[PDB]
C-alpha cells in the first residue's frame, strides 16, 4: 500500500496544467489495464477513455499512439522509434493518449521496461536520442495477467477486466466504477436482440409467445439481464467477452435474416405459421454451438492446443436463410417426424437424434405444403443441382463451374459453408489442419467460385515463413486492403487475404491484430472494403518417443545436452514437434476448429486425379494407372503405420514420387541401354530380360522417395511389392532392381583405385 500510495501521489498531474489524464481516475497519467482472461476489455477501455478524451477536454484532436510489442525479448529500441514522431514540440503540450500493448508473446524485459519507462520517465539508446515522459500524455498499459510476495505489477494504477460472469457474479447491483467495467451501456447496438427475453418468458405457444412481428431498433431490457440470458443459452460454462460477443453476432445475423422475407403478411402462406419463430430461436440458438463454443481444450504445454471439436465430431446443423430472399438452406440435419406429433433432427447419414422437438406437425405440413428444400441429400446428386443449391445458399445467382476436378460431398460442402457464415457475420475464420489437409484447395475453389468469370485475383495467400516479422505481415495486409478497394471498385468482388500456416512465427499476435480487433500497427482496417482474411495453423503434436531416440541416436546428436536448448514451447523442445509452430495468441484459441480429416476415399480420388495428371505427357497404360496408384497408395499407408520412421504423411509426396518417376521413365531409353552395357560388361552371362520402362521406372521411383529414406526396407518391400504386376511381386527384385541402378549410376566416374564401394557410398 506505501508503494502504491506513493506512485500514485507522484503520477498526479496538478489541476491547473491541461494533461490527458482528466479521462482517467482522479487524474493519474500512468495506468494498467490487465486481466486474468483474454478477450475481456482490455482495449475497448482505451477505446472508451479516449471516446470520453474528445468530449470532456475541448480539444479538436487527441493523438492516439498504439504501440504493440510482439518479441518475446522486449526491444526499447522499436518504443523509442515508435515514440521518436510524437516528440516534435506540436505534441509536447498537447494531450496525446499513449497505448502500449505488450502482447502474450513476450517473456523477458517486461518489468525492467515498465520500470525504465513509467517509473525512470525515460527511455535511452545507444545513439543517444532520449524520451523523456511528460505528466500531459497518459500512458495507459494493457497486459496480459502474467500468473505463475507481489508481482511488479500491482504498484500501479490498475484496471481489471472481468469476463462476463464474474460481472454478473461480484456486481450483482450496477454500481458501475471506474475500476470493474460491465455491460457497455453503448453496447446496445447488435446485443439488443433480445427475442430470448419473450421465447423464454412467454414459454407457452398460444399467448403469442414471439408473437407475428417482432424487430430492432430501440432497447427493451436492463444491462445486468441481458449478460444473464446470454449465459443460459451461450453454451460456454465460463466465456469471456470474445466469446459472448461472437454469439450474440452470429444469433443478430440470422434472426435478422429471419425477420426478412417468408416473415411478412400473406394470405394463405401457412395461415397461421405457428411456431416458425420458436423454431428459428431454438434451432438457431441450438446450430450457434458450432460456431461460439471453443473447439480447443479448455506433452504438458500441449494440453491447450488438443482439438476436441474434431469435423467427424457432432454434426454441424447449419440452417441459411439464402439472401436473395426467397428461400431456406436445410442442409444437415434431414428432421424426422416424432411419434407423439413431434419432428426431431438426426444425422446426416447415421440417423441418430441430435435434438429433440425442434418444430411440430402442424407446421412440418405447413412447410412442405410450402415446397421448402427440406430433406434434400446432397450426398447422391448431380453437380449441377448441387452447385446450383450451394450458389444459390451462398448468394451469387451465376452457375458456372469454376472447376470440375474438385468433388463436392457434404462434409466437404458445410464447410465451404461455414467459411461463407463467418464471413458475413464477422467472427474472425482461423483453421487447424494438417499439410496438404485440402484447406488450400477448398478456399481457391470458393476465391473462384466468386470470381465466376473475371480475370481478378481475388486469392491472396501468403506463405508465412519462420522468418516472417512483423513489417511483412503489416505490408502484406495493407497491399491486400488496397487490391480490395481496387476489386470492389472495378468487378466487385471479395477478396480474400489468407495466411496460410499461421503459428509458425515469432510473431503471431499481428495475425491476431489483423482479424480479432481489425487493426494494422495501431491503424484500424478500413471497414466495409470487401477484405475477408482467414488464416490456417498447423496442429500442435509431438513425435513419437520411438522417432525422438532414433532422431536423437543420428550421427553424433546435438551438440550439447537437449535439455538445455533455447528453443521450447513451454517445456518441450521445437525439435520434438511435428511442426515447428509457436504458441497460439489466448484470444485465438475460442476462434479455432479442427478442418477436418482426409478420408482414405479422397486420398484414393485425389491420387487417381494425379496419375491421370500425367497420361497427357507419359501415355500410360489402364495396368499402368492402376499399378501406380495402388503403389503409391499402400506406400503412404505403410509410412503413416511406422510411427518410428514417419511421423506424418502428406498428399504434396505423391506429386514428387510422381515427378521422380517422370523424369525417370523419360531417360528410361537410355538409362536402361546403359544398364544393358553395364550388366554385359559383368561376368553375368545374358540373363537380362524385358524391362518394361513404367515398372522399371516406378520400382526406381519408390525406391528413392520412400524406401531409400527408411530403416525398416525390408518391411516396406515385403508389403509393397504384393501391388506389382505377377511376374514382378518379389522384395529380393525390389532389392536387386535398386541395387543394379546404384551400380550403374557409380559406374562413369573415375572413382580411384583403393576407394570403397559399399552400400552408404551407393546410395549417397
Ligand atoms: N462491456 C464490455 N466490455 C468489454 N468488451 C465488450 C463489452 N461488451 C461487448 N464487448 C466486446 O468484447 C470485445 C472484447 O474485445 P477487446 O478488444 O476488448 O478484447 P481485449 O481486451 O483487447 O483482449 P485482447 O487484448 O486479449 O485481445 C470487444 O471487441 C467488444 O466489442
Ligand atoms: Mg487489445
Do not use: C
Given at each position: 500500500e506505501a508503494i502504491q500510495a506513493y506512485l500514485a501521489g507522484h503520477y498526479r498531474v496538478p489541476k491547473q496544467t491541461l494533461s490527458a489524464a482528466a479521462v482517467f481516475n482522479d487524474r493519474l497519467c500512468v495506468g494498467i489495464v490487465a486481466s486474468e482472461r483474454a478477450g475481456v476489455g482490455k482495449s475497448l477501455y482505451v477505446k472508451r477513455l479516449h471516446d470520453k478524451m474528445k468530449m470532456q477536454l475541448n480539444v479538436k484532436n487527441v493523438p492516439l499512439k498504439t504501440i504493440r510489442l510482439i518479441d518475446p525479448q522486449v526491444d526499447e529500441s522499436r518504443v523509442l522509434g515508435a515514440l521518436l514522431p510524437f516528440?516534435?514540440?506540436?505534441?509536447?503540450k498537447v494531450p496525446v493518449l499513449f497505448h502500449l500493448d505488450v502482447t502474450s508473446s513476450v517473456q523477458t524485459g517486461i518489468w525492467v521496461f515498465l520500470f525504465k519507462l513509467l517509473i525512470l520517465q525515460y527511455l535511452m539508446d545507444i545513439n543517444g536520442k532520449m524520451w523523456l515522459r511528460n505528466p500531459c500524455h497518459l500512458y495507459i498499459v494493457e497486459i496480459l495477467e502474467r500468473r505463475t510476495q507481489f508481482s511488479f505489477l500491482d504498484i500501479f494504477p490498475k484496471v481489471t477486466c472481468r469476463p462476463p460472469k464474474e460481472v454478473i457474479d461480484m456486481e450483482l447491483s450496477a454500481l458501475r466504477s471506474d475500476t470493474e467495467p460491465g455491460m457497455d451501456l453503448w453496447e446496445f447496438c447488435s446485443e439488443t436482440f433480445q427475442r430470448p427475453y419473450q421465447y423464454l418468458r412467454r414459454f407457452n405457444q398460444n399467448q403469442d409467445l414471439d408473437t407475428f412481428q417482432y424487430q430492432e431498433g430501440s432497447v427493451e431490457g436492463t444491462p445486468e439481464e441481458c449478460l444473464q440470458h446470454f449465459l443460459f443459452h451461450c453454451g460456454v460454462i465460463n466465456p469471456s467477452w470474445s466469446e459472448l460477443r461472437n454469439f450474440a453476432r452470429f444469433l443478430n445475423y440470422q434472426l435478422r435474416d429471419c425477420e426478412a422475407s417468408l416473415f411478412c403478411n400473406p394470405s394463405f402462406i401457412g395461415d397461421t405459421l405457428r411456431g416458425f419463430k420458436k423454431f428459428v430461436v431454438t434451432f438457431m440458438i441450438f446450430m450457434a454451438r458450432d460456431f461460439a463454443t471453443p473447439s480447443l481444450h479448455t506433452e504438458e504445454d500441449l494440453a491447450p492446443f488438443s482439438?476436441?471439436?474434431?469435423?467427424?465430431s457432432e454434426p454441424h446443423p447449419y440452417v441459411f436463410f439464402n439472401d436473395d430472399h426467397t428461400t431456406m438452406t436445410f442442409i444437415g440435419f434431414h428432421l424426422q417426424p416424432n411419434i407423439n406429433g413431434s419432428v426431431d433432427a438426426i444425422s446426416?447419414?447415421?440417423?441418430?437424434?441430435?435434438?429433440?422437438?425442434?418444430?411440430?406437425r402442424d407446421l412440418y405440413q405447413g412447410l412442405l405444403l410450402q415446397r421448402?428444400?427440406?430433406?434434400?441429400?446432397?450426398?447422391?446428386?448431380?453437380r449441377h443441382k448441387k452447385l446450383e443449391r450451394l450458389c444459390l445458399t451462398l448468394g451469387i445467382p451465376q452457375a458456372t463451374d469454376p472447376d470440375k476436378t474438385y468433388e463436392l460431398t457434404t462434409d466437404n460442402m458445410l464447410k465451404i459453408l461455414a467459411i461463407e457464415m463467418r464471413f458475413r457475420c464477422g467472427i474472425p475464420v482461423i483453421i487447424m489442419g494438417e499439410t496438404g489437409c485440402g484447406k488450400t484447395r477448398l478456399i481457391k475453389f470458393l476465391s473462384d467460385l466468386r470470381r465466376?468469370?473475371?480475370?481478378?485475383?481475388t486469392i491472396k495467400l501468403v506463405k508465412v515463413h519462420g522468418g516472417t516479422t512483423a513489417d511483412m505481415i503489416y505490408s502484406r495486409v495493407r497491399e491486400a486492403e488496397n487490391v480490395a478497394f481496387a476489386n470492389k471498385d472495378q468487378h466487385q468482388l471479395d477478396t480474400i487475404l489468407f495466411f496460410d500456416e499461421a503459428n509458425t512465427t515469432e510473431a503471431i499476435s499481428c495475425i491476431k491484430e489483423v482479424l480479432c480487433d481489425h487493426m494494422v500497427d495501431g491503424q484500424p482496417l478500413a471497414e466495409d472494403s470487401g477484405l475477408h482474411i482467414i488464416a490456417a495453423c498447423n496442429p500442435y503434436r509431438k513425435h513419437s518417443e520411438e522417432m525422438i531416440c532414433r532422431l536423437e541416436s543420428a550421427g553424433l546428436g546435438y551438440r550439447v545436452s537437449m535439455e538445455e536448448t533455447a528453443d521450447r514451447l513451454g517445456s518441450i523442445p521445437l525439435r520434438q514437434l511435428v511442426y515447428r509452430v509457436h504458441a497460439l495468441p489466448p484470444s485465438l484459441i475460442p476462434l479455432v476448429w479442427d478442418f477436418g480429416q482426409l478420408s482414405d476415399v479422397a486420398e484414393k480420388l485425389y491420387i487417381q486425379q494425379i496419375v491421370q495428371r500425367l497420361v497427357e505427357s507419359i501415355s500410360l497404360d489402364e495396368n499402368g494407372t492402376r499399378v501406380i496408384t495402388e503403389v503409391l497408395c499402400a506406400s503412404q499407408g505403410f509410412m503413416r503405420k511406422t510411427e518410428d520412421e514417419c511421423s506424418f504423411v502428406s498428399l504434396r509426396d505423391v506429386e514428387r514420387c510422381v515427378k521422380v518417376f517422370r523424369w525417370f521413365h523419360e531417360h528410361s531409353a537410355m538409362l536402361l541401354a546403359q544398364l544393358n552395357a553395364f550388366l554385359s560388361k559383368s561376368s553375368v552371362s545374358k540373363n537380362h530380360t524385358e524391362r518394361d520402362p513404367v515398372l522399371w521406372s516406378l520400382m526406381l521411383a519408390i525406391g528413392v522417395c520412400?524406401?531409400?529414406?527408411?530403416?525398416?526396407k525390408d518391411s516396406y518391400r515385403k508389403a509393397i511389392a504384393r501391388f506389382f504386376p505377377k511376374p514382378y511381386d518379389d522384395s529380393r527384385l525390389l532389392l536387386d532392381e535398386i541395387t543394379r541402378a546404384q551400380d550403374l549410376f557409380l559406374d562413369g566416374v573415375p572413382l580411384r583405385k583403393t576407394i570403397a564401394k559399399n552400400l552408404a557410398l551407393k546410395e549417397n
Open positions: 516528440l516534435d514540440a506540436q505534441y509536447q482439438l476436441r471439436k474434431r469435423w467427424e446426416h447419414l447415421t440417423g441418430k437424434v441430435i435434438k429433440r422437438d425442434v418444430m411440430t421448402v428444400p427440406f430433406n434434400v441429400d446432397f450426398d447422391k446428386l448431380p465466376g468469370g473475371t480475370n481478378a485475383d520412400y524406401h531409400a529414406s527408411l530403416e525398416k
